[PDB]
Scaffold this active site. Structure first.
Site, PDB file in Angstrom:
ATOM      1  N   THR E  29      49.635 -13.310  96.764  1.00 52.21           N
ATOM      2  CA  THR E  29      50.577 -12.204  96.654  1.00 52.21           C
ATOM      3  C   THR E  29      52.014 -12.716  96.546  1.00 52.21           C
ATOM      4  O   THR E  29      52.355 -13.791  97.051  1.00 52.21           O
ATOM      5  CB  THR E  29      50.454 -11.278  97.872  1.00 52.21           C
ATOM      6  OG1 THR E  29      50.793 -12.006  99.061  1.00 52.21           O
ATOM      7  CG2 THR E  29      49.026 -10.756  98.018  1.00 52.21           C
ATOM      8  N   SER E  30      52.863 -11.930  95.885  1.00 59.41           N
ATOM      9  CA  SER E  30      54.299 -12.192  95.894  1.00 59.41           C
ATOM     10  C   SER E  30      54.878 -11.943  97.288  1.00 59.41           C
ATOM     11  O   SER E  30      54.524 -10.969  97.954  1.00 59.41           O
ATOM     12  CB  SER E  30      54.998 -11.307  94.864  1.00 59.41           C
ATOM     13  OG  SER E  30      56.362 -11.658  94.734  1.00 59.41           O
ATOM     14  N   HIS E  88      53.005 -19.259 101.185  1.00 60.10           N
ATOM     15  CA  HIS E  88      51.667 -19.061 101.715  1.00 60.10           C
ATOM     16  C   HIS E  88      51.156 -20.376 102.290  1.00 60.10           C
ATOM     17  O   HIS E  88      51.687 -21.449 102.003  1.00 60.10           O
ATOM     18  CB  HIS E  88      50.714 -18.547 100.632  1.00 60.10           C
ATOM     19  CG  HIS E  88      50.921 -17.099 100.312  1.00 60.10           C
ATOM     20  ND1 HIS E  88      50.721 -16.098 101.241  1.00 60.10           N
ATOM     21  CD2 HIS E  88      51.341 -16.485  99.178  1.00 60.10           C
ATOM     22  CE1 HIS E  88      51.000 -14.927 100.691  1.00 60.10           C
ATOM     23  NE2 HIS E  88      51.373 -15.133  99.439  1.00 60.10           N
ATOM     24  N   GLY E  89      50.133 -20.279 103.131  1.00 60.25           N
ATOM     25  CA  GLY E  89      49.579 -21.485 103.723  1.00 60.25           C
ATOM     26  C   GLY E  89      48.210 -21.252 104.328  1.00 60.25           C
ATOM     27  O   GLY E  89      47.737 -20.120 104.454  1.00 60.25           O
ATOM     28  N   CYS E 130      51.151 -18.995 106.650  1.00 60.44           N
ATOM     29  CA  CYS E 130      49.964 -18.717 107.435  1.00 60.44           C
ATOM     30  C   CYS E 130      49.249 -20.021 107.783  1.00 60.44           C
ATOM     31  O   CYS E 130      49.392 -21.041 107.102  1.00 60.44           O
ATOM     32  CB  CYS E 130      49.039 -17.792 106.664  1.00 60.44           C
ATOM     33  SG  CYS E 130      49.745 -16.118 106.514  1.00 60.44           S
TER      34      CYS E 130
END
EC number: 3.4.22.56
Lengths: 141, 5, 94, 92, 141, 5
Positions: E29-30, E88-89, E130
């Protein structure tokens, strides 16, 4: 509200799990020197006014049973909780005398929603165990 | 002796 | 109406960095526990706990180096790893 | 005289190991919001680990997710300070 | 001897990697709101006298090349190093715009033996990402 | 709106 309230009637429990001798099926060496650690820790945390309980050579089933029992005690009059784990380990894992147990299985007993008399109070886990097999070559300064 | 855990 | 995270107020004082062995002397005890007890004895009435553990990090990092006849295990070093989900300062003294 | 090659690192993670981390589309992430607020308030008064402890308390107490999906609603977050530092860090 | 020396001529660099928009192939996601974070961090570390360098929407190859290049700079006159990752992660992983890279690959460039002008100096990594898919239900106070 | 990373 910058520091934890530490003037409850009792400092809290300090549980020391000292695993020295392992079952042959684990292929794990005896951890010479760990009794020195355990005795040093007992004196140190007694001087900090903790109620210190030393346990030696527990299976993984006994570690889980002990930790669950401790988490279901009434800690209302205690300021904090300390658990010291001395054993073999891998990343995320400590060894009972008869094999591995996830650290998360032990600490989960003390979650804010599972140990209500410790909610809001510091829960300290001190872990002497390997976290893998890397070695640090260091750098000369 | 130095040993690893 | 107010909650805290169920993972809040834990502190994990690990003897070594993620992925690494941890060192123990067969007669003197583990480098980390030796150092932790020494710094608690010296500083528990003077310093906040995270600052005590930082002195433990420095002691383990500077004062210990392994000996082995196996070159793979010789002259190695260790840094402990403080993992704090605490929400307040922790003093053993009032 | 050697030091560990892993010494003198600090990892200020937004969330505990294994967990999602939360972000608000208008205000920014809970963690960075709180980190910037605490650095502004305390960087001339507190050692860095004590600043990050205040960030932990702010994220833990002041934020709770909102979602139409019950799976994601009313959730909480605690950041995770990982210190291999060997000295105290003051920005002044 | 108890505090890091922070009176070098420069506080040091603050590298901010702000990944908002991800390639279709990642399914990611953006990250609405991350520009607010990046601006907040820019101002905060400006007031602390860090040399802030904002980077936006970097592929994993561009992240690695940036970290390699920054680690090859002469940090002799700098007190410290700060890197902020916004993306993100997963556990141990940060996302470039086109896919994941291990955090260890990024931080290894600054190891005491591979970035000698940062040996003995604090190296701070601030990670908004994350670490898995668990949700914390919380407990009432 | 609140979203996860």
């Amino acid at each position: 509200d910058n520091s934890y309230k530490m003037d409850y009637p009792e400092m809290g429990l300090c549980i020391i799990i000292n695993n020295k001798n392992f079952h042959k099926s684990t292929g794990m060496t005896s951890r010479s020197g760990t009794d020195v650690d355990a005795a040093n820790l007992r004196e140190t945390f007694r001087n900090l006014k903790y109620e210190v309980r030393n346990k030696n050579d527990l299976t993984r089933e006994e570690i889980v049973e002990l930790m669950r029992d401790v988490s279901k005690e009434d800690h209302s009059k205690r300021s904090s909780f300390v658990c010291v784990l001395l054993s073999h380990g891998e990343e995320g894992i400590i060894f009972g005398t008869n094999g591995p147990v996830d650290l998360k299985k032990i600490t989960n007993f003390f979650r804010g929603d599972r140990c209500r008399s410790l909610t809001g109070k510091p829960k300290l886990f001190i872990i002497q165990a390997c976290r893998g097999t890397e070695l640090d070559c260091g750098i000369e300064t | 002796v130095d040993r690893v855990d | 109406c107010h909650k805290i995270p169920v993972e809040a107020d834990f502190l994990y004082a690990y003897s070594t960095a993620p992925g690494y062995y941890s060192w123990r002397n067969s007669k003197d005890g583990s480098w980390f526990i030796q150092s932790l007890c020494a710094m608690l004895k010296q500083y528990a009435d003077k310093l906040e706990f995270m600052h005590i553990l930082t002195r433990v990090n420095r002691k383990v990092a500077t004062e210990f180096e392994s000996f082995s006849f196996d070159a793979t295990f010789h002259a190695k070093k260790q840094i402990p790893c403080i993992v704090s989900m605490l929400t307040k300062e922790l003093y053993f003294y009032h």
